[PDB]
Design a protein around this ligand. Structure first.
Ligand SMILES: *[C@@H]1O[C@H](CO[C@@H]2O[C@@H](C)[C@@H](O)[C@@H](O)[C@@H]2O)[C@@H](O[C@@H]2O[C@H](CO)[C@@H](O[C@@H]3O[C@H](CO[C@H]4O[C@H](CO)[C@@H](O)[C@H](O)[C@@H]4O[C@@H]4O[C@H](CO)[C@@H](O)[C@H](O)[C@H]4NC(C)=O)[C@@H](O)[C@H](O[C@H]4O[C@H](CO)[C@@H](O)[C@H](O)[C@@H]4O[C@@H]4O[C@H](CO)[C@@H](O)[C@H](O)[C@H]4NC(C)=O)[C@@H]3O)[C@H](O)[C@H]2NC(C)=O)[C@H](O)[C@H]1NC(C)=O
Ligand SMILES: C[C@H](N[C@H](C(=O)O)[C@@H]1CCCN1C(=O)[C@@H](N)Cc1ccccc1)C(=O)N1CCC[C@H]1C(=O)O
Ligand SMILES: *[C@@H]1O[C@H](CO)[C@@H](O)[C@H](O)[C@H]1NC(C)=O
Ligand SMILES: [Cl-]
Ligand SMILES: [Cl-]
Ligand SMILES: [Zn+2]
Length: 576
């Protein structure tokens, strides 16, 4: 009956709200007051939600959904039939939840110590080392040490995790966990579409890579940089070499056009975590988008707590499933990177608020990439010299300043493309059994080489598990969403710049206060997961494909500059 599928999704919706709230409830209380008290309540909440998932998922499975007339109801029920981990038998479920928890915990408490000297955590201590050291051996120490202590300690967990995550996926009708993850895009052509997009950004990436390598050669010495080879992975200013803007100082196109210390000026002006998020909120509301509610301000955690209570520090945005309570937890450092991340997280919150009246099953982004993209869009405008100046973080003109800013943007946006691409290429092949525990690491480095053109500064040996040194691997968060985000964020920016009436070069656009730009975003965000994502894309951009052409157009002046510069020096693009 049509009416009985209707009643079912109504009940699911009512009961999911309550149960999901309680779990987000408990999970929050844990994350922002790790104790074994909150940790014991979290465990009990895990079983509660698994038990509701099972109850509802079993019932949803009894609907012959072909026969379902209403498309929203068909779509909700189809999703409820996926139990996720709740599909597992009781034993396996217990052990998977515990694997996830032990992996996350291992990663987040791992420290690197000098022999009778200090122990360094990943944030801020090792992150700052990677960002600011210019000494090969000091970078290597932090780079190797992090892998020694985080990645190797993940390895004892990973095989069992893969086994249980694949098992849950097969139990929900997928072939393996990767297949389950890719199905979030509802795009049978996903893998080839992503490949084409990655191929489109190779000229820009290869030219960026070659110019950066020559600049490293100049700093680190001819004996340590091969001008036709991969770059050693510890020299890019970032623990994973996944963004390169901390070595802007070594690579500036035009040293003659100096620019302000963004970080120093924020500090210099006593920016706090709160001002950072307040500025993010202001940008959202300038677009006519929704302000975060008063509750957000009361309950969010915007900086490492100081009552000596212990917390999980990775920036994250939280929906509590009651249409009222949305939160961010981030141990905000006062710097440029973190201001972007504030925007990133605030984009998540905006989406939560835009779709909060849908059925919970439809409360997701049009695809995971759209969710990751929202904040970054706003942040592209934020990073303009024009905007940074309006916030009193830059002094201003020239072609030089322009090429300098593009370079700064490139070391964030372009460098991340291969990295964000390779992560799930690796995991997809682990999940499908192509990569086994005997070759996790070797296959990671194959992809690190093939896609990013990087090599490990020291030989890896059996027992290393470098992937486990990147948060999302032990936390089991899919990563392709970030490669998608990075492409479609420039298309969004181009479309909103167009809505806003900007003309001339795309990278000069700043959509601050554009109500036309807000309306495009709001309409798409309001859809949630109610319609195939090409419809949200078409709402924003007027067409329905993912496309690198906007990112290319944004970067085109930099492409020309890098070609001229690379050609002048005879660079050989790539790493034979
Ligand atoms: C197939 O089924 C789907 C699903 O049906 C729904 O779910 C199933 C399981 C059954 O329960 C159904 O009975 C139930 O209808 C059908 O899709 C639905 O179709 C109707 C319209 O035909 C849509 O109604 C719109 O709903 C929005 C918002 O909905 C929520 O939020 C409101 C405000 O917060 C609140 O008033 C509602 O009660 C509702 O509540 C939420 O419900 C979800 C669960 O569904 C729950 O999880 C939430 O927690 C809960 N929220 C709260 C607060 O508790 C509503 O805003 C719309 O109003 C406008 O639309 C009318 C039509 O044009 C218009 O006459 C009104 O004046 C009003 O106008 C607009 O108002 C705006 C803003 O103020 C204004 O700017 C505009 O100018 C104005 N527009 C005009 C005049 O053009 C509206 O009623 C449902 O959204 C929709 N559900 C979804 C998400 O798909 C589908 O129709 C069926 N298909 C077929 C083949 O028939
Ligand atoms: C810091 C940023 N943090 C993430 C993040 O915000 O995504 C955190 C951790 C990963 C999940 N996450 C969240 O906050 C989610 N609750 C977001 C979400 C998931 C599903 C549905 C809706 C919303 C991040 O890792 N980033 C940011 C860019 C690159 C990547 C990285 O650091 O490697
Ligand atoms: C932290 O946890 C303990 C045990 O759950 C609790 O009693 C205490 O109130 C919490 N502290 C804060 C500040 O939330
Ligand atoms: Cl690595
Ligand atoms: Cl994803
Ligand atoms: Zn995110």
């Amino acid at each position: 009956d049509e009416a009985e599928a209707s009643k079912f999704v109504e009940e699911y919706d009512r009961t999911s709200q309550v149960v999901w709230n309680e779990y987000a409830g408990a999970n929050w209380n844990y994350n922002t007051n790790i104790t074994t008290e909150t940790s014991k309540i979290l465990l009990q909440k895990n079983m509660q939600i698994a038990q509701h998932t099972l109850k509802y998922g079993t019932q949803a499975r009894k609907f012959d959904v072909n026969q379902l007339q209403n498309t929203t109801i068909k779509r909700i029920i189809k999703k409820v039939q996926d139990l996720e981990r709740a599909a597992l038998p009781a034993q396996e479920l217990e052990e998977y939840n515990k694997i996830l928890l032990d992996m996350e915990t291992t990663y987040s408490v791992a420290t690197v110590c000098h022999p009778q000297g200090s122990c360094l955590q990943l944030e801020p201590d090792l992150t700052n080392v990677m960002a600011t050291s210019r000494k090969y051996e000091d970078l290597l120490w932090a780079w190797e040490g992090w892998r020694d202590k985080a990645g190797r300690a993940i390895l004892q967990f990973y095989p069992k995790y893969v086994e249980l995550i694949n098992q849950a996926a097969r139990l929900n009708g997928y072939v393996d966990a990767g297949d389950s993850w890719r199905s979030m895009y509802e795009t049978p052509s996903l893998e080839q579409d992503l490949e084409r997009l990655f191929q489109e950004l190779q000229p820009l990436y290869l030219n960026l890579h070659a110019y950066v390598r020559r600049a490293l050669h100049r700093h680190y010495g001819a004996q340590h940089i091969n001008l036709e080879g991969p770059i050693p992975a510890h020299l890019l200013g970032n623990m994973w070499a996944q963004t390169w803007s901390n070595i802007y100082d070594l690579v500036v196109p035009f040293p003659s056009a100096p620019s302000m210390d963004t970080t120093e000026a924020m500090l210099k002006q006593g920016w706090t975590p709160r001002r950072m998020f307040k500025e993010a909120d202001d940008f959202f509301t300038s677009l006519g988008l929704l302000p975060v509610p008063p509750e957000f301000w009361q309950k969010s955690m915007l900086e490492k707590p100081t009552d000596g209570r212990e917390v999980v520090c990775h920036a994250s945005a939280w929906d509590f499933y009651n249409g009222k309570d949305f939160r961010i937890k981030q141990c905000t450092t006062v710097n440029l990177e973190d201001l972007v991340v504030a925007h990133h997280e605030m984009g998540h919150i905006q989406y939560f608020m835009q779709y909060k009246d849908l059925p919970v099953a439809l409360r997701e982004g049009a695809n995971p990439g759209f969710h990751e993209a929202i904040g970054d869009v706003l942040a592209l405008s934020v990073s303009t010299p024009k905007h940074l100046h309006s916030l009193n973080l830059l002094s201003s003109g020239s072609d030089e300043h322009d090429i300098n800013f593009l370079m700064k943007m490139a070391l964030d946006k372009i460098a991340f493309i291969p990295f964000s691409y390779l992560v799930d290429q690796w995991r997809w092949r682990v999940f499908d059994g192509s990569i086994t525990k005997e070759n996790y690491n070797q296959e990671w480095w194959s992809l690190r080489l093939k896609y990013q053109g990087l090599c490990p500064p020291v030989p890896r040996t059996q027992g290393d598990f470098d992937p486990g040194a990147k948060f999302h691997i032990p936390s089991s968060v899919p990563y392709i969403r970030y490669f998608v985000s990075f492409i479609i964020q420039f298309q969004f920016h181009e479309a909103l710049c167009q809505a806003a009436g900007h003309t001339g070069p795309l990278h000069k656009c700043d959509i601050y206060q554009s109500k036309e730009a807000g309306q495009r975003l709001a309409t798409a965000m309001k859809l949630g997961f109610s319609r195939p994502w090409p419809e949200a894309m078409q709402l924003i951009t007027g067409q329905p494909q993912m496309s690198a052409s906007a990112m290319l157009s944004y970067f085109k002046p930099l492409l020309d500059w890098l070609r001229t510069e690379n050609e002048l020096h005879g660079e050989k693009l790539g790493w034979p």
